[PDB]
Design a binder for this molecule. Structure first.
Ligand code: 1SY
Lengths: 181, 181
């Protein structure tokens, strides 16, 4: 089912990343100037996107790792979309703790289409096996990396974080990408 | 690319319809009791979903047909999703005019994945032809109809309106489904 992940990666770019990435740095700048706690470090630029290859996507990031704690929302982005007046795109800011201290602050989320791969593997009517799932997750990631490599909307404002579990620290994994910038 | 539309229909159910359909009638009832103009007819039950087979999805419904006019928003539905705190799902209410008079009122929108099919057909990197597009749109609709036929979340709260253009009246097409209930 090569075309499953292919379609989902295109949909994630077309219906989301291409719409929010151009306005993201402006939203982060607005937050850093007008809303961020005066005493804290600036929110990093770039949207950090988590890509668990096992497609396990909890809705609360603190459930994946206690060292990842919700801080605040960015200013919302709204726009008329497919007949929906003022559809809302929102993103959450997280602090990343290391040794109990805040080590980084960034806009962070899971890639939601991985939830579709997971659920399709669980619904009999989808005809999608658990083995198909890992292969489709990798293909989703590869397709997305290839799109963003060529996309004009991606201008050092997006970082993909793919990982697998076999102890693994998600916060440390995000900190490693953060510290690379 | 059978699997393209297959994936997109599953994603539309998993990541949207299964999440909003269970709460929709409660939201419509809330609107009809607390927000609707006292002098107007009740907002119809059911989400009406437009499926233009040519995948032409304008963002403003008035552009497709002047007799479809935005009225109001339903109360928003929010929830934590894939690391996004309080992700917002919103829906718009439209009046449908006939002979200048309001003939119906309903929650109405286009199926957004049809936008992905359209854009994939325009981007060279997607490897998706314009001919592939019509066939995938039909397959998207058939797959979605089959999912919703078996879905426990769909309890006479969703109506799919598929159509093609070869004069065609969108408002009349929606009124025909409305008057069937
Ligand atoms: N993290 C995240 N935040 C968002 O606001 C968002 N919006 C879309 N997406 C994802 O991007 C891709 C393309 O979006 P599209 O609109 O074409 O399809 C969407 C859309 O048709 C519908 N849907 C989801 N939320 C809404 C909504 N608030 N209003 C209308 N439709 C919605 O159901 C499909 C799947 O939604 P998601 O399962 O969240 O994943 C989508 C998809 O992978 C999002 N991902």
């Amino acid at each position: 089912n090569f075309n499953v992940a292919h379609g989902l990666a295109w949909s994630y770019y077309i219906g989301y990343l291409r719409l929010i990435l151009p306005e993201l740095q402006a939203r982060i700048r607005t937050y850093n100037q007008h809303y961020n706690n005066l005493l804290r470090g600036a929110v990093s630029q770039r949207l950090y996107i988590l890509l668990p290859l096992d497609c396990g996507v909890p809705d609360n990031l603190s459930m994946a790792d206690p060292n990842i704690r919700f801080l605040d929302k960015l200013p919302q982005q709204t726009g008329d979309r497919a007949g929906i007046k003022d559809r809302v795109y929102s993103n959450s800011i997280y602090e990343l703790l290391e040794n109990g201290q805040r080590a980084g602050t960034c806009v962070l989320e899971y890639a939601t289409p991985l939830q579709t791969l997971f659920a399709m593997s669980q619904y009999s009517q989808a005809g999608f096996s658990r083995e198909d799932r890992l292969e489709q997750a990798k293909l989703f990631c590869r397709t997305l990396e290839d799109i963003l490599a060529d996309a004009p909307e991606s201008q050092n404002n997006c970082r993909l974080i793919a990982y697998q579990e076999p102890s693994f620290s998600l916060s440390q994994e995000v900190l490693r990408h953060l510290r690379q910038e």
